């Protein structure tokens, strides 16, 4: 059959990624406090990320690229480490993105967060700890090996790179994601 093409709806990429285990599809969500179209995407991609079968591992990293990219994105890392059993997941994101709130310094974050069932003494110190610094490195050099450059952007299993910008619209950009699934999925479907 096969209805999309590379460069075109999306963008397969000759230097991939692997995970710690093979089993489920990852599919890594990179995003930013600004990129407009991402926003516009948001509302679009958490409801199928939810609606999801057993077959697919959604994950959201910050695109730590240096300067104010990295201090925006390092909150969320924060905000899991303390241990949030998933409290409200959009209205971090619907903090940031529709209310417009700064959100740029800890002092900011924390303070913002002390009505969201977060703790200041909890977010503060594994913020400013080793544990977080583990986090950073990672998520920073992953970006850097998934050919992300900038967002919104989306990878499955570390091969295929694909956006708004590639597949036409946000609308769109699912219609990539379930195909590229897929196509992973072949490889070790009996």
């Given at each position: 059959?096969?209805?999309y093409?590379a460069?075109?709806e999306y963008v397969?990429?000759?230097?991939?990624?692997?995970?710690?285990?093979?089993?489920?599809?990852?599919?890594?969500?990179?995003?930013?406090?600004?990129?407009?179209?991402?926003?516009?995407?948001?509302?679009?991609?958490?409801?199928?990320?939810?609606?999801?079968?057993?077959?697919?591992?959604?994950?959201?990293?910050?695109?730590?690229?240096?300067?104010?990219?990295?201090?925006?994105?390092?909150?969320?890392?924060?905000?899991?480490?303390?241990?949030?059993?998933?409290?409200?997941?959009?209205?971090?994101?619907?903090?940031?993105?529709?209310?417009?709130?700064?959100?740029?310094?800890?002092?900011?974050?924390?303070?913002?967060?002390?009505?969201?069932?977060?703790?200041?003494?909890?977010?503060?110190?594994?913020?400013?700890?080793?544990?977080?610094?583990?986090?950073?490195?990672?998520?920073?050099?992953?970006?850097?090996?998934?050919?992300?450059?900038?967002?919104?952007?989306?990878?499955?299993?570390?091969?295929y790179?694909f956006?708004?910008?590639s597949?036409?619209?946000?609308?769109?950009?699912?219609?990539l994601?379930?195909?590229?699934?897929?196509?992973?999925?072949?490889?070790?479907?009996?």
């Open positions: 059959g096969d209805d093409t460069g075109k397969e990429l000759s230097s991939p990624v692997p995970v710690s285990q093979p089993g489920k599809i990852e599919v890594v969500e990179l995003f930013w406090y600004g990129c407009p179209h991402c926003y516009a995407f948001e509302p679009t991609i958490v409801p199928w990320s939810e609606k999801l079968p057993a077959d697919v591992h959604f994950v959201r990293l910050p695109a730590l690229f240096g300067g104010i990219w990295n201090v925006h994105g390092q909150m969320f890392l924060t905000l899991e480490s303390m241990g949030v059993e998933h409290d409200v997941h959009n209205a971090v994101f619907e903090a940031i993105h529709k209310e417009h709130k700064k959100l740029a310094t800890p002092e900011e974050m924390a303070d913002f967060l002390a009505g969201k069932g977060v703790d200041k003494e909890k977010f503060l110190s594994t913020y400013n700890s080793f544990a977080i610094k583990g986090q950073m490195e990672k998520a920073k050099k992953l970006a850097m090996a998934y050919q992300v450059t900038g967002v919104p952007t989306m990878v499955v299993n570390g091969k790179r956006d708004i910008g597949a036409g619209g946000p609308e769109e950009t699912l219609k994601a379930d195909y590229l699934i897929e196509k992973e999925r072949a490889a070790a479907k009996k």
